[PDB]
RNA sequence: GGCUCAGGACAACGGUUGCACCCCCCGCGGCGGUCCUAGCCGGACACCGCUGGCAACCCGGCGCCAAGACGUGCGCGCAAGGGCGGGCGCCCGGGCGAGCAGCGUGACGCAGCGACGGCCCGCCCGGGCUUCCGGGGCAUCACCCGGUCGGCGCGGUCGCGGCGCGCCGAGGGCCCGACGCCUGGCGGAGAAUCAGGGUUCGACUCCGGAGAGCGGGCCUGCGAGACGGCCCGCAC
Ligand SMILES: [Mg+2]
Ligand SMILES: [Mg+2]
Ligand SMILES: [Mg+2]
Ligand SMILES: [Mg+2]
Ligand SMILES: [Mg+2]
Ligand SMILES: [Mg+2]
């Protein structure tokens with residue numbers, strides 16, 4: 077009343093009573109939210125990569141012994 | 151309610167101990183599931199909130215299960231036809247009630263669809279060429295909400311065959 | 318040859334137990350997969366046994382026996398943990414259970430003297446042991462097996478005939 | 488029977504080695520769960536108020552802690568009831584004071600000042616090795632910390648050096664005859680000695696025989712034997728070297744100080 | 746947390762074991778891969794406005810609006826459970842005194858996390874049960890018990906177990922005092938008395954147990970058979 081909306085801007089005329097009072101908009105994404113989500117994704121990827129590297133080097137070690145772990149399927 | 155505390159029993163000498171507290175919630179029990187074979191109606195499984203937030207599911211009605219032929223390493227999901235033997239009581243058999251240790255007949259189609267072409271135990275194959283195969287239940291319905299098992303093999307198969315043949 | 322004879326006896330027994338139609342259920346060892354008994358060769362073991370681990374030795378009867386007992390400490394599924402004790406046999410009337418008598422002393426400070434006291438302790442007796450009244454037994458602690466039983470027999474020493482009853486703290 | 492967990496603590500029911508006055512009050516602080524347990528710890532407020540004396544009340548300690556003025560193993564802690572334990576690092580940058588929490592011969596917690604070179608690590612006792620999810624080898628310690636993928640050469644009851652900044656193992660000391668140790672439980676807390684014998688009983692406790700530098704010999708169970716190096720301590724220890732004087736000598740020292 | 750000691754006499758309680766029969770919030774440290782509109786999803790209620798019932802207590806109907814609320818859910822296969830996988834008289838690593846854990850593989854099932862990322866693991870405090878020893882008086886109470894004793898099987902439970910049910914057998918306790926009855930009976934750490942040996946008490950400061958008029962039942966929640974929480978009967 078005035079999906080996939082890139083700008084995310086909006087209006088502000090609202091209603092006035094003197095002090096101007098308008099409800100704060102919710103469900104809006106700007107720089108802070110976009111940046112936060114991107115940082116979280118990067119952190120999760122980094123964590124997974126570090127754990128995989130640690131597993132690989134541990135497996136490279138123990139060449140003179142036996143191991144038992146859940147083989148990654150798919 | 152229902153409880154399994156030992157304060158309401160007698161002592162090893164047969165004496166009355168006496169009671170010193172009211173009932174406690176740690177020592178409670180619940181009414182049995184009495185899981186029924188299906189033979190508004192369909193697979194129905196309930197969920198129970200147990201101590202510690204843990205979840206327990208009891209089956210009330212079910213019709214299928216996973217069964218394994220250990221000797222040949224063959225496993226499929228098959229439909230259960232009816233319960234034919236139970237050691238605890240014959241009333242459970244009449245009602246077609248599923249519990250661990252029940253002896254049941256399953257459909258042969260998933261097995262015969264691929265069998266009857268390789269050398270194996272003669273008896274299982276004779277069952278395969280028919281309509282049903284004798285089997286057993288190994289899971290606990292009422293605790294895990296499932297009814298799995300295995301196909302009978304040797305001496306136990308002979309025991310149960312000799313048991314149910316005269317009937 | 319020796320090994321082949323053992324499997325025959327183990328294989329044979331499972332079939333009489335299947336011919337005992339008076340019994341309501343088929344008793345089997347949980348660990349063993351029923352199916353090995355149709356293998357004509359002897360490349361799969363048919364009986365399961367373990368070691369107690371406190372320096373005790375597994376009887377030959379258990380290894381070469383043909384009995385099923387889920388409460389036996391050698392062929393069953395129970396574990397020994399806790400206190401080991403000694404006593405004498407007082408009664409042996411139940412199917413697989415006995416009553417053990419333990420004797421000890423109690424001191425009374427006022428009179429500077431002692432009293433003799435005894436207690437009765439019930440235990441499970443596996444078919445691998447033969448026991449009569451007056452025998453000496455070693456019992457190991459297990460999980461609750463029934464209303465009055467928390468012990469299992471692990472060693473038996475015979476006692477001679479008509480031997481006088483004696484106060485024997487152990 | 489209480490219907491749930493306990494949140495309070497009577498003063499008379501508190502541990503003796505805390506040294507709390509009978510008339511201080513009805514109550515004593517109840518430490519919160521953390522690195523160390525109730526009977527092998529001491530709350531932060533007790534150190535900050537009844538020893539160092541930088542505060543005179545609960546409230547002042549609360550302000551000091553919520554203003555971020557104390558670091559425990561490199562991490563600021565704002566809980567007045569946070570538990571402090573053995574071989575912990577206590578640093579206060581505002582006054583350039585650094586202490587390591589150890590035991591005195593009498594059997595109480597003491598603050599041994601340290602240097603910058605040795606404050607980047609701590610010693611931990613490994614008492615449990617287990618397999619976690621996916622069969623991954625793990626390892627736990629006395630301060631409630633777990634490390635994944637430990638060296639196979641590390642066994643139980645060993646001692647481990649870990650950098651404070653990064654929880655990575657550097658070197659490890661094995662539990663063996665001839666290694667300097669420190670007793671952390673029982674009648675012999677705070678004594679230092681070398682292992683002379685090890686005797687095990689099947690299904691029961693394992694007893695360790697130790698000899699002090701002066702030739703005295705004492706026994707204790709393995710559950711409270713801490714390795715602190717290879718024949719020489721790896722960290723700075725109190726001025727005294729784990730020697731417990733007899734009552735006579737302690738009385739002489741008291742009279743001298745009088 | 747605070748109050749009290751009615752009830753309960755192989756029980757509670759005190760010391761000593763164990764769970765290889767168990768559950769656990771906060772906190773600390775780790776770990777963090779999820780089968781088949783993602784510049785940000787959908788619909789509501791509360792407060793509030795209009796119209797109202799009733800002595801009181803109590804609420805009704807209509808109406809626009811928010812979420813770290815509810816629901817759906819973007820994603821590198823992953824919850825519970827189930828079958829198979831060691832020996833040849835015994836003993837001489839992930840881990841034990843102890844064949845316990847984990848893993849692979851053939852089938853089932855898609856549980857939990859995810860519109861500002863927490864499912865899971867370990868420790869800690871706490872709880873539940875459990876071994877051994879101690880644990881009032883009366884013989885004008887001498888024989889007692891019949892799920893009482895044991896075995897097999899299922900069910901239920903966080904979990905072992907006659908805890909419950911079916912079948913089988915017959916057992917278990919007793920002058921080293923059973924069973925029954927009585928108590929103006931909570932227990933211990935301790936108190937009074939005073940050569941030494943002891944006698945009597947222990948409502949009350951600390952620990953532990955039990956209860957909230959009597960008797961029962963239950964929801965929420967990690968945790969209560971809770972009563973300054975709800976439902977019923979009885980007496981007020
Ligand atoms: Mg998906
Ligand atoms: Mg949501
Ligand atoms: Mg009373
Ligand atoms: Mg009290
Ligand atoms: Mg209460
Ligand atoms: Mg109540």
Ligand SMILES: [Mg+2]
Nearest residue numbers: 748957972973
């Ligand atoms: Mg009131």
Ligand SMILES: [Mg+2]
Nearest residue numbers: 746971972973
């Ligand atoms: Mg209250």
